[PDB]
């Protein structure tokens, strides 16, 4: 980075002092232990288990100064009313200070995120950073920005909600210069409740940009009400401004044109949604001066974002959840509160599948069972563990669980059920249930997901 913990303290309102301590100058911010390095600045979050309870295997890792709600003895402490709030106000004011060109997205997809396109494109001119994965929560921005490499001249961020107004937040600490809504009204709509209501938060991103700012949003009708007053609106879609005239897909390719260009474009990628992504990224790769061509030559290669997390259908019109990447305490416990708040599916089953999470390291199997508190018998009908680390966990759902709501298969060195695990799935899932399978991606893991599809 480019900080210095009395800087930061400064910034945050260090209720304790500094002048204390050295003030050395920073080398990055992490809120994984696990990941902290020498003269990095620790940053305690309430996650699975709580951050602080991590700040001495921090410095032990190489931590130069931690933030933290509480002293810290013996060690250089910034002081504040709450962690993530002061690690925001850090990424708001560090964004002050880069003088970046901040682009705000919102809408994942799939294939190929608008998030991963605008990005391409800006990055044949100039030198670019993107939120990284799906780091785009109230966590992962302030992350991102943060992690912005030195010399950053476009920085391409990704605004996801669960709640609205989680947009509006993201949107008034990065203070984007330009924004995209691509939106698709949610089916079970988890914690939200509607497509306007949606459409109400994505139009947030807007409210922390500055007066004639270009914001890009569909054509669809379910925007208007939420349009900002003072920015510079162009809408995409058939009829819209921009629209794409021209559309051609092969067996996995794809061709379109767009009414502001002159040439069709290439995508190797199959999908309107991936060609209006396109579209919308382009437009704006062209606001900031750069040529049709290199990007007709950009797309040229561009990058499969695996999957990303997506309900999907196995044989059996069923509503699959397969989270393949975030393999940690935290995320499941997320990823599993989220999933138990979307009432069910027809009949009104609720099925979860939970395997290993591999590198939580020496306290892995104590971290297991951390879930056990984000698990209740009320809300899911069946569990499945899969795994071994996750074996006292199994333990502790089937004692607070009904009797046989639970199941247990193994897998290590000398074994590996998972052959029964199959199924038992198979069995247990029906055309009309739900099923999150959340932990490590493993070889078996993938498989099971295959046959729940075939
Ligand atoms: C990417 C942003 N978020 C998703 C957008 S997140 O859910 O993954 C999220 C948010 C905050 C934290 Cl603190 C974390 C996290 O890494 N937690 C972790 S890793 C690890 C442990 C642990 C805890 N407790 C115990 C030993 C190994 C994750």
């Known amino acids: ?28 911010a992490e809120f994984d232990s696990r990941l902290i390095g020498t003269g990095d600045l620790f940053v305690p979050l309430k996650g699975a288990r709580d951050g602080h309870d991590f700040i001495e295997t921090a410095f032990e890792n190489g931590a130069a100064v931690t933030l933290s709600e509480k002293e810290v003895s013996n060690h250089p402490y910034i002081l504040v009313d709450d962690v993530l709030t002061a690690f925001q106000s850090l990424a708001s004011y560090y964004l002050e200070k880069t003088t970046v060109d901040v682009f705000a997205v919102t809408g994942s997809n799939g294939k190929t995120t608008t998030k ?52 509006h937040l993201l949107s008034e600490l990065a203070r984007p210069k330009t924004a995209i809504v691509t939106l698709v009204g949610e089916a079970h709509l988890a914690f939200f409740k509607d497509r306007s209501e949606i459409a109400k938060g994505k139009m947030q991103i807007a409210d922390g940009m500055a007066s004639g700012s270009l914001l890009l ?74 040529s049709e061509e290199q990007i007709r030559l950009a797309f040229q290669h561009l990058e499969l974002t695996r999957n990303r997390t997506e309900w999907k259908k196995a044989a059996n019109g069923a509503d699959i959840l397969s989270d393949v990447y975030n393999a940690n305490p935290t995320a499941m416990k997320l990823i599993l509160e989220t999933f138990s708040a979307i009432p069910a599916n027809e009949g009104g089953k609720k099925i979860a599948v939970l395997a290993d999470m591999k590198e939580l390291g020496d306290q892995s199997v104590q971290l297991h069972n951390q879930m056990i508190l984000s ?58 249930d739900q099923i999150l399978l959340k932990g490590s991606n493993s070889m078996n893991l993938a498989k099971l997901v295959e046959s729940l599809e075939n």
Request: hydrophobic residues 40%; charged residues 25%; aromatic residues 8%.
């Open 1 to 28: 980075m480019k900080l210095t913990i009395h800087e930061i303290a400064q910034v945050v309102g260090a209720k304790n002092d500094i002048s204390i301590f050295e003030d050395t100058q920073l080398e990055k």
């Open 116 to 167: 991963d396109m605008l990005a391409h494109l800006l990055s044949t001119r100039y030198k670019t950073y993107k939120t990284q994965g799906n780091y785009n929560n109230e966590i992962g921005l302030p992350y991102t920005v943060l992690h912005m490499p030195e010399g950053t001249e476009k920085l391409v961020l990704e605004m996801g909600q669960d709640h609205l107004g989680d947009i």
């Open 217 to 290: 949003a569909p054509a669809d009708p379910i925007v208007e009400d939420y349009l900002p007053i003072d920015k510079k609106v162009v809408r995409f879609g058939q009829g819209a401004e921009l629209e794409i005239t021209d559309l051609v897909e092969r067996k996995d390719s794809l061709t379109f044109k767009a009414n502001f260009l002159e040439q069709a474009l290439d995508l190797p990628v199959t999908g309107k949604y991936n060609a209006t992504n396109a579209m919308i990224a382009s437009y704006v790769a062209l606001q900031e001066g750069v």
């Open 375 to 432: 698990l209740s018998p009320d809300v899911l009908d069946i569990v499945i563990f899969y795994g071994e680390d996750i074996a006292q966990l199994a333990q502790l759902a089937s004692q607070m669980f009904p009797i046989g709501h639970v199941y247990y298969f193994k897998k290590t060195e000398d074994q590996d059920q998972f052959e029964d695990l199959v199924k038992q799935v198979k069995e247990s899932l029906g055309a009309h």
